[PDB]
Amino acid sequence: QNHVLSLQIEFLSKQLQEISDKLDIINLNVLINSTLTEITPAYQRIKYVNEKFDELTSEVIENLNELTELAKSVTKNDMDSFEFYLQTFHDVMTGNNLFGRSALKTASELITKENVTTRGSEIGKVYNFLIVLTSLQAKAFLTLTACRKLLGLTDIDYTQIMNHHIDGQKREFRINILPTLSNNFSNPSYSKNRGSDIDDPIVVLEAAPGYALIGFEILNDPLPILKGYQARLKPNYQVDRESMSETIYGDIHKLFCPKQLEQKYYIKDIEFPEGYVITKIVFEKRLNQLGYEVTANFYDPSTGSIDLNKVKVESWKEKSCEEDSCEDEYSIIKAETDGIYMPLGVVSETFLTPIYGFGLTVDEKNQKITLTGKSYLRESLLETDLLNNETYLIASPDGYISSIVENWNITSDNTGSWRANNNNAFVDKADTIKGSSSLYTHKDGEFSQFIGNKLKPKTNYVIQYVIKGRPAIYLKNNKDTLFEDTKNNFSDFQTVTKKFNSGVNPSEIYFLFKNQSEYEAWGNNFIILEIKSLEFLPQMLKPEDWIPSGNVQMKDGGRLEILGDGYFKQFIKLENDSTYHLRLSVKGTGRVSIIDESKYLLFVNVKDEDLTRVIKNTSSKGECFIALEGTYVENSSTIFSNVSIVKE
Amino acid sequence: QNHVLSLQIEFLSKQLQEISDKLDIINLNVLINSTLTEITPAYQRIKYVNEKFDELTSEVIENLNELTELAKSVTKNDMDSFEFYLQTFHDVMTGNNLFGRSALKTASELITKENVTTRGSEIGKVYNFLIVLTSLQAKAFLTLTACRKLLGLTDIDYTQIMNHHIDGQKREFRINILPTLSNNFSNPSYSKNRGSDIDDPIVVLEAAPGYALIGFEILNDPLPILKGYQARLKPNYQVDRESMSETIYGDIHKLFCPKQLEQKYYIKDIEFPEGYVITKIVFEKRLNQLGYEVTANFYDPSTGSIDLNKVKVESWKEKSCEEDSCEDEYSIIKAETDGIYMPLGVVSETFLTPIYGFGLTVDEKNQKITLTGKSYLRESLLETDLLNNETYLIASPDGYISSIVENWNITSDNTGSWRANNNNAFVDKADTIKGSSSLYTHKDGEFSQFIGNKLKPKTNYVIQYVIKGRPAIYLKNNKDTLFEDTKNNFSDFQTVTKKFNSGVNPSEIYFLFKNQSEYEAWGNNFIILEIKSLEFLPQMLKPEDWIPSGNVQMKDGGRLEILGDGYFKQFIKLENDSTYHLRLSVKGTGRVSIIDESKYLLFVNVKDEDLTRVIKNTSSKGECFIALEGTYVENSSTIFSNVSIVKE
Amino acid sequence: QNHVLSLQIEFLSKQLQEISDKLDIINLNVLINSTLTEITPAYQRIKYVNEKFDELTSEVIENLNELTELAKSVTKNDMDSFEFYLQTFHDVMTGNNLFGRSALKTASELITKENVTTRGSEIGKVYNFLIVLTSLQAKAFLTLTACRKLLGLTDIDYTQIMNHHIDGQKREFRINILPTLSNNFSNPSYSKNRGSDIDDPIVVLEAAPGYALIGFEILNDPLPILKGYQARLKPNYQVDRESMSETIYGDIHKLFCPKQLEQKYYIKDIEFPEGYVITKIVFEKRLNQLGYEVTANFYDPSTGSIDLNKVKVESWKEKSCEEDSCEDEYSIIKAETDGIYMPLGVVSETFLTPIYGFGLTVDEKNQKITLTGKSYLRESLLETDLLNNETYLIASPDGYISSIVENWNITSDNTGSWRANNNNAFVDKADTIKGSSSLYTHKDGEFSQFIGNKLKPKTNYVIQYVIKGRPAIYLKNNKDTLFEDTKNNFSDFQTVTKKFNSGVNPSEIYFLFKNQSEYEAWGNNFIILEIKSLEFLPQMLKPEDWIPSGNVQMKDGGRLEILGDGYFKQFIKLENDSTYHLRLSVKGTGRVSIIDESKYLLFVNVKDEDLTRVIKNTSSKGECFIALEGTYVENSSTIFSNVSIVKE
């Protein structure tokens, strides 16, 4: 009963903590209400004046008169003038109020609390809040200069006042707000997909010797796949806009998700000292023990050059290695059925930036995977924008940046390698809207483009395309349309991704973006790229030493289909002190037999399942062969998939 | 003492929950204060401009000049213009603020908390909040066009801007607000009226063939009464107006409230898959066991046309699927001496829709008898106004819509049912000048209307009507009056909700609304409808085989008077393995008799009270009957009340 | 230890209650912030316009031009006009906002919480809040009419709009706010003074047969004294302005405060039915058992007549009498030394009103006295102002309303019975300020007034006077200045109260408000009235049956000073079955002796103390005499004060 009272008191202490959190949210909302009462009339007026003067700071007589009257209202020297609202906005931003509170402080406190589903860090969110307000004021001073010029009044030079206002606010942020926080983020969201276990996958993300890795990306709309970003770096941990890349990878769910068997994920914030940039991250999943490799070459921060010889390496992935180099302290996961919470979305920073540290922080208690990096972000922005230089600051990549299709983002009214094969297939910057060219094709239009020369045989490719109407999408080599999408009619530019294995001869594939059989079709942003197939670590089995025994044929995936009476055997050498993870998946019922010479080291029936037999320390006298003797009947088709006796 | 400490800790946990609820109300009020600080100056100005331009968007030189000056102020292109206030209203509504909060979100959070005495659902309340704001903006753009035209300025076409503003707000509602709610509904209040335990009230709530039942309603002012509605079901789970109707049942306190004996309440959440619409409910209270058999039919969501072939009947049998004691899944309400808190008011859904589920949700902790059905309203709207096609929306009613009196209130200028017998006894207003439509009689006044052909012998009818001044209500055939009220001179149009029993031969009873005196009279809203006499489950007592034995005769209420001495006798075969329950009250000191050929299976006298007898194994030797006798007093005519020998 | 845990949990439950109270205060402050955000810009502008147009709605050309320009701004038909601010003020008051909250509701919730040191009830405070806002709007419509007339514009008749606004707000108050509360208040504050115990005080507060008691008052600046209010009543529990009175009483601390001995204060809400008005309240303190008497004659509410024969009486004061008429259930107080928390301030309602009920709710746990009345206030205001008739509504009396000095509030530049005896003693409406005449007398001024004819011998009088400068205050009969105040110089009209026993001949006392010896003097509000001396209940001792025995003399207070060798004896009759509270206080050491004939029923020495010997049931054979034999020496002066052998 005293134990029951203790549990009830622990329940009360939890309720009091939830109450104390609710109070901290309420107190903050009260401080937001104070700053809104101070800043809202100025913010709303500045916004309206900035929006209504967009063309001039970027019917003729009517709008010019309607704007001239507004300009007279704006430049008027009243107590309630536009200059009054600009000054009060600056004062509330800095904290020159009745009680010394700043709008930047209450905003920073807000962002720190409501950072629930936020992609980036507290510094980057509070700084983005500062950027939108400084841009609003700068545009407001620009409209005020434009209004004075339009009326023919004298130039007051608001550059000095605007600079004093912007610098004082950046100084308030630097002194009282920024001694904030940390450079660690993760993947945006989680997803449940299925992978593999009898595989030995391995994935490297290495940047060019002049590049550093500038981000990641995982999409699963065609299939779960890792997209890898890297680019040449500019001074002060800045990045060159061109040379940025997105590196599509294999069935990344495989290396991510298990199949009803445990996983080994080591946990450590690999971090090298400053200036060191990780131009390569390997990943290695062998026997479901998924490791990786984070190593950083140095980078001279001042001159955009990454060092090409001063590598720093942490071969292991676990915090136990950070002190002992003994491979332990992973995170073990008992595999859930539907699929592990694989990362979904884009693994990058709001601004592409060299990361110096990275850590794996999977939380198997919820079967959820989480990462943690460490980047030079404070040391990249702290020198250029916070010192107000030529800002080379580029937002994060949401999706695809390029395409195998040239001019895929047709936006300047040009075809390029596209081919305007009709007078309804005219490039038409305003195909359906001048917001973007999206090649117009109505009732006979066709835009063609050779894409096959880049389509290479026995390789999967990704395709996406922003298409209005019912477009005639074609991946055709004039003989075999490796993929065609002429099915959907889209009034609202619906874009989706699929896959296809480039056939034996894709090297002739034209893209033929025609209209349709007949409809009104539009389309741009024809993102097509190559889907990498996942590679795997070695083994002891080989697709060549197999000895077919009649009515048995091997397939493209080394599949060795048992077409009936017969088998494949492979003389493999097994040794006394060595262990062997014999692992294989079958399509169609059958058996597998390791007859050394007379003894059955292994003989089991396989219907459709992942074999995982770990052949223990056993001396195979002479040579043993895994006689892949599937079912022995006419309609027997025992298609193995992964021939792996991979030795422990 | 440890048990006392546990109870004190449970009291602390309740106090902490009340504190956590208070914090959630406070946090919401703080978020309302933020949105008020943002939106109030625009809302107030839009409202004032909309109200002051009503005739123009629906003394002349003065009003025209004052409105022309107002129009010059409204159309003026300042920073503080009417267009500024419209744009800021749109931005605060969508969430384009300093911190990304929308007025629609804080309003939805408000309505979700203060839904205490709200008639309709969260969706319908938040959508009604959206409608009043969108209408306010649309009228504001309309006054702005009217002001430009009045001044003679160029037309700017604000239809495009208004549509963009309205659609963006409806999109915000559809995406970020609407993906919340439930569709339960219950009674608002409760009533205490001593019901029945002597009787077995079974009540059927069945819809017409083309109808489904579309609401409940509980009355106590005329009497404990069940009010009901039923109507055709249109396409899209909406309901046909003109096919609605009313049905009124008797003493439903006797159906729900027990009197001085406990009542069993089969909590039975009868629910059906989608497409099913309740075409029948039976409520079953035998031996105070309030079960209820319900039969819902299926219904084609589109094209209306409830299909009368796919029915389901889950009477009490949701626990039959899991437990032999299907007699479980109930509750126990103990009848205190004033009755039980039967519902009072209305168990219905905000807007008219088929209900699919129903359950019994009594609360004997407060005697709170609560009905609860499951409506299709969520569906009935998510497809209609969310798509903005027809929105055939009718909210739930409150009083009687159906009346035997034709032109029950008045249509207008025409009382074709009534008779304007006198010229001066005209209709007082005749068009919208005296509040609502209402008859009027003065110094001779009368209004005759034949409804005797619509009145049945010996049946209870509930009466409602609204009257002002000096009225003389009459319901007569110029020879006897069924209902009359010519008193209580009142202020303005007060409502009656009472009952009466229709006469023994009312085939000629017509209504004669006259004047109370030589003064002027007013009245309207004459509601007349039948009250279905409460009907009970049959038991082996039938009045015909009664043998009136000695100065006696069969009576009306199933009563069997005993004038002085004598009795009523009738043979009823009791069994030696079955239990019977003789439940009967008397008016006059009586003696009931359960005697065998020699011995007294029961030996009881009844003075003026009921009789609750649970007879154990009734050893039966053939001869079983009851001699419903009184005692040897000349004055007290023994008059039993309710024959019920119900065979357990 | 479990008991210690229970006490700790009770401490936690108290902390949670203090937290829940803090939340209710916070939630209310958040609702006040919402209404302030809605109503503040309108309230401030209405207030400024009302204050700046005061002389017109009550430097010629310059003020007229500045007000004409202001009037042009006020009457201007803009979106931000004065009419806009009036309409928005009305809408926020009624609750026609974005979310349906009314300023009247949040204000009522405020007043209900912050009613800590509030004199009147919740109804009267919330109604006073409604009055100040309705008056603000009415004055605002009035300034708007005045501004239109001043500019020469057409009359718009804002009476209709103003009436609609005022009536709609009074309707909101009547429906949603007023079904509020209760008619019970108490004394405003508490005070620690000292009284008496061996006294038998008794105080009646009876209104004239045409009057009802209209309030109370207790002041203690000269000495703690009760001031009693009563007046003839006007229809609907209204009061005639004249005939109001203030009835000064005795040393009310005496009847209020004990002297180190217990008190008996009975507790009951004496309440008679409606129309019954308490035209008399007796109070009786005998043997420290302080009782009273609250009896109510009827009052025909319609015609201002109190009934003069239909008395209703509750002779006792205790709730035990309200059911048994057995004198018990008092509140007993163990007397504190410094003094009981006697009522300080004015015991009345904010508006003078007939009280029908009254209760004593002393709280001796804090030694604090509290009262509780029940008045017809809702039924007096509910008919006149809430029906908008000629409001005869008079605020509560703070201090004195009249004076024995005629024209005491010299305000119309007239002396009256005052006498301007100098050309520096000129009445001078602007003596020092035209805000009030306050008779000016500089360096020779004198104002004289005969006040002695009303000053009656051997009676105490109260005096107060609002005086600037050093005034020559005189209560002089040209031979003996019974009191004179020529001492203080007051720049700021400092007024104070004192006392004086009118001498053997006060009937000639002139008031001679001269200046001074010489200074600048001012003065008005010469409140002078008669200080009643406290009377007492009877006893068995008598000041006449005393038998002096040489060197002994009686004084004015029946004091019987023992001037040395000698005594007073008084043959008193004591009986067997009777008890006698012999009680007496002495000045100077001495003794008292009750020699019956030979036996010492009582002989004790008395130095300076309250004798309280309760002579028990004792048969005095023949006659006994209390031989007041004080100290027997030359310098013996044993001045007894209260000769009371008052028989139990």
Residue numbers in the entry:
A (entry chain B), B (entry chain A), C (entry chain D): 141 to 198, 214 to 803
Provide the authors' own sentences about this structure as they appear in the paper.
To investigate the structure and activity of proteolytically cleaved Vip3Bc1, we performed a trypsin digest to yield two primary digestion fragments of ~68 kDa and ~21 kDa respectively, which we term activated Vip3Bc1 (Vip3Bc1act). Mass spectrometry analysis indicates that these fragments are formed primarily by digestion at K205. We obtained a 3D reconstruction of the digested complex by single particle cryo-EM analysis to a global resolution of 4.8 Å (0.143 FSC threshold). The structures reveal that Vip3Bc1 to VipBc1act transition requires extensive conformational rearrangements, but consistent with previous biochemical analyses, retains its tetrameric state8 while opening an approximately 5 Å pore. We were not able to directly observe density for an extended alpha-helical bundle in our single particle cryoEM reconstruction of Vip3Bc1act, however we were able to use deposited Vip3Aa16 coordinates to generate a model for Vip3Bc1act EM density due to high sequence identity (59.9%). We observed that Vip3Bc1act associated with the membrane in an elongated ‘open umbrella’ conformation, ~15–18 nm on its longest dimension to the membrane, with a stalk interacting with the membrane and the bulk of the protein density distal to the membrane. The helical stalk modelled in Vip3Bc1act does not account for all of the stalk density observed in the sub-volume. Following cleavage, inter-subunit interactions at the conical tip of the complex dissociate, allowing for helices α1–α3 to rotate and move down through the gap between the ‘propeller’ regions of adjacent monomers, and form the extended helical bundle at the base of the complex, as visualised via cryoET and consistent with the reports for Vip3Aa1616.
The Vip3 (vegetative insecticidal protein 3) family proteins from Bacillus thuringiensis convey toxicity to species within the Lepidoptera, and have wide potential applications in commercial agriculture. The Vip3 proteins have molecular masses of ~90 kDa, and are secreted as soluble proteins that form tetramers in solution. They can be proteolytically processed by trypsin or insect gut extracts to yield products of ~65 kDa and ~21 kDa that remain closely associated in solution. Vip3 proteins are proposed to exert their insecticidal activity through pore formation, though to date there is no mechanistic description of how this occurs on the membrane.
